[model samples]
Target: SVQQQLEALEKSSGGRLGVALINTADNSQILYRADERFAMCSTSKVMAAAAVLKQSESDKHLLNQRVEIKKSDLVNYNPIAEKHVNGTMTLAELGAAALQYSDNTAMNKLIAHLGGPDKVTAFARSLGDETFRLDRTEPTLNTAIPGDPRDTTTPLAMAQTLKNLTLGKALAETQRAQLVTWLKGNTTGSASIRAGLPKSWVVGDKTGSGDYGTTNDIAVIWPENHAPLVLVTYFTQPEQKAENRNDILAAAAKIVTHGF
Candidate 1:
């Protein structure tokens, strides 16, 4: 029945849709095309930020240490990060920008610090995510070529990874809290998942948008007197001319939350 409802949405969406909804408390779930690949877009920044935090366990100075923001690091859509060009900001600040503002430059700096995209992939593996993939950096990675597999992930895999990262599975409590704090104040995801949620619930989300109608949001939702829920919404279509469908994601989010 859930799948049927989602299938209807897919037909009207003029695209493929993937969703992974999980109750963090009971581990109950619902999935739609959960194993399929979709461009990760800016959502990769959250995973990269988590991986960077993992490294900080070894280098206590990692987050506190300042890193220079070179112009060469910038890519498209860097409203917040471009302001820091030719200057310096702490690793933590860069990470916050990467997560909160979807700052392209900030994300590139984190990727650089991690050595390569494979390192981010490796970090996901360490978290038990075998389906995660990150083959490129920002701007180029944002291409979202209909079926191209680079820099893509499945809804199910990303859901589990998000759950783990936010729940302290591979990180310390403080690190987890810091990531959650950054996500809570995110300035880029307002119109997707957040728009669908009731005003009283606590929520934090990361979104990705790219070529060919690909749009996505992954988040943790805290309902009143309930534990939390992790929801992953990924939508994509083959038409390069197609518009990214935030409204569909918003509608799907509304549908999922109501079922809970």
Candidate 2:
């Protein structure tokens, strides 16, 4: 049923969309695609969080490790959410704010605390993501490097990583709990995955947009009766408005929630 529904929706997307879905319970992949590569944007924050948590566990640092932000941390390419005011923030709070608000300042702080861009890059490398690279200036670092403001990732790996993180396979249980909490609290970019779920339903997801050329939502939808589903989509060449860009992803969500 999903196969047929998805086939139709994919066609209706006019081929500008790339999608991947997997049922966590059976490890059955309902949909798998690789037609496009997308900029992860805030979605890459998840990887950054994972690395920080893993390091903390090994180092035995307190979860609420208070770290100060220097004025030199300001980034020019992206808006800094925590720069206007800097105080000692715990790793948990920063990660939560970054994941929930998609806060550039918070994410950059995490990257900085996690050992800066090189460390975050090493973390992605450990995860076997050869294609992902952390962009310059992080969240705050006066090194304003700008060209196109893009970050890249693939739908296939994104879907798998979402599943891994959700299932506690990506980090320790306590760390996993923190990761899920922040993701469930995500507040930015609602054009796609969050567009279809019921008010009561819970979803842990991340979204990204590259001007008019890219729109994406990567999420793990949780519904009663059925097992959790990993959904990832990349939409490119958007129409005049963002609504049109998110339409097919929303339709796919409808088909996904059809049973319950």
Candidate 3:
């Protein structure tokens, strides 16, 4: 059912769109697309967060370590970091800010603490995802690069990552619950997948967008009295307007929500 709607949207979108949906309760993949990597943008922060959560299970002190946020860490894209440019916070607080508001500076701080992009990739690989690559940091400017592979991932990989996080693969149950709570309170991408669903449904998602027309939202949708579904949608069309991209992802959300 989800696949049918996704196919229909792809046909009418006039742009390349990739979608992946999975019913975690049934362990069934509802939809999949051919291999194509789209810029992940802020959605890449999830992997970095997962890496930190995994490591925190061993070194409990890391979460309490305080780090000062310098003015330089505040970049052009993050409104949250711009507001609190010189504040000090712990690793845990920074991670929460990164997830709840998609704070670019906070995300970069977490990445630096975890080592680097390679370390994040290693953690992703440990979770059985090798195709998801993080090549750049936050506040990434959009450019006309062929295939736009700067920070890339397929819909399937994103869905799998969400599923893993949902299943507590990266963090313990309590820790994962906290992360999910932060995602549930995510305020960004309001026009994207979140707006399409009914208010009764519960959603936890991470959104990514760029001025060059890359829009993505990876979400875990909970239906009333039913299993939670993992939905991943990625769209890249340099010519399309940003609102148009949001509408496309929202359309996909409506399609998935129709079943519930």
Tell me the spans in candidate 1 whose CA falls farther than 4 Å from its real position. none
Q: What is the lDDT of residue 58 in candidate 2?
A: 78
Model 2 deviation from native, Cα RMSD in Å: 4.5
Per-residue lDDT of 20-105 in model 2, one digit per residue for the tens?
A: 77777787765535434655656777877878787777767755687665566544332334544565667777677667766666
Put down candidate 1 lDDT per residue, 95-210, tens digits, no spaces.
Answer: 89988888888888888888989999999999999988899988889789977899999999999889888974778988899889989998878889888888898888999998
| Whole-model lDDT values for every prediction | 0.88, 0.66, 0.77
Candidate 2 collision pairs: 73-140, 73-141, 108-139
TM-score: which candidate is best?
1
lDDT of 3 by residue, 101-182 (tens): 8888888889888887778888888888888878767676233243766678788888888788865476788668867887
Assess every candidate by TM-score: 0.97, 0.79, 0.91
Candidate order, lDDT descending: 1, 3, 2
